[PDB]
Design a protein around this ligand. Sequence first.
Ligand SMILES: Nc1ncnc2c1ncn2[C@@H]1O[C@@H]2COP(=O)(O)O[C@H]3[C@@H](O)[C@H](n4cnc5c(N)ncnc54)O[C@@H]3COP(=O)(O)O[C@H]2[C@H]1O
Lengths: 85, 85
Amino acid sequence: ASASVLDYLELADEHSIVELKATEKMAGQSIIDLDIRAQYGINIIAIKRGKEFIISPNPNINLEIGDILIMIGHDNDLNRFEKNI
Amino acid sequence: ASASVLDYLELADEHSIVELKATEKMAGQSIIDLDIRAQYGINIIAIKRGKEFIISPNPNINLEIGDILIMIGHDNDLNRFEKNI
Ligand SMILES: Nc1ncnc2c1ncn2[C@@H]1O[C@@H]2COP(=O)(O)O[C@H]3[C@@H](O)[C@H](n4cnc5c(N)ncnc54)O[C@@H]3COP(=O)(O)O[C@H]2[C@H]1O
């Protein structure tokens, strides 16, 4: 629980973790609908909805407009996902 | 806002990031064999291989001995997965 935190900090400092806002194209759909990791190689860590923090989001729930997705992956993969929306 | 993830976990008393070392029971299996998120609601952010981090792990690779799964989810879900191993 203390080594677990330090590995996260080390991991956040060698791979980039990014905030990304949900577009209209993507609202109404779930992250299993978009099939993100199979399509981009990206992992979605959490969702900020309004002032609520959804950790380990259920992949079957509907994404709303303005949802801020917290992502981890290579910049080459994050950039493609950001452009495809 | 990679700390926003870490900040939530510190104040949250029911959610937590936990490391779990792969056992022979679990080695030889993939995380899609175990179907971890679909079965427990747990998200695996990365795998520690040696002292290196495999981010957004490919769910089809076999887990090797000594692999450290870095997991994030509800304490009851994490605890249930751990007890089944
Ligand atoms: N890092 C991980 N941690 C825990 N379990 C993992 C995992 N990678 C794979 N799995 C497990 O393997 C199943 C299929 O993974 P896949 O990545 O190919 O295909 C996934 C993926 O493309 C997408 N997805 C789901 N949750 C995601 C997320 N947090 N980030 C990105 N994509 C996700 O929806 C598909 C099916 O998701 P589902 O949860 O139903 O089922 C997942 C999940 O049970």
